[PDB]
């Protein structure tokens with residue numbers, strides 16, 4: 001929220017606006033009536049209230065629609081949503097790349113702000129305590145849904 005740095009306040013509205021107004025977050029009503037072309041994975045962390053179910057739909061090697069649902073914090077609802085908007089018409093390869101490249105930046109290592117884009121606000125969550133699993137919980141669910 002501060003304004004000494006240039007990134008901080010701009011980076012702390014992307015989280016606030018993808019957590020109070022997520023783009024791809026559905027209701028438990030809306031999820032049950034989804035077409036059975038969607039796959040699902042629920043991942044839960046015990047370090048927060050983050051228990052999210054992801055929904056991906058494949059159309060000839062291209063992920064066409066991604067939605068997520070459930071309970072989550074700002075770090076979980078922003079990381080999932082921002083990730084969801086970006087994997088939105090990409091292929092089942094070049095998503096598995098973002099996931100591990102995102103995880104390496106979450107693990108405090110090399111990242112490309114051109115490849116990770118608005119996931120680069122999470123570039124130093126390994127410095128905030130017990131927030132690493134909050135920024136991995138929803139993307140690990142996507143990870144399973146791309147492989148299995």
Ligand SMILES: [Zn+2]
Pocket residue numbers: 047048049050072073074075076133134
């Ligand atoms: Zn959390």
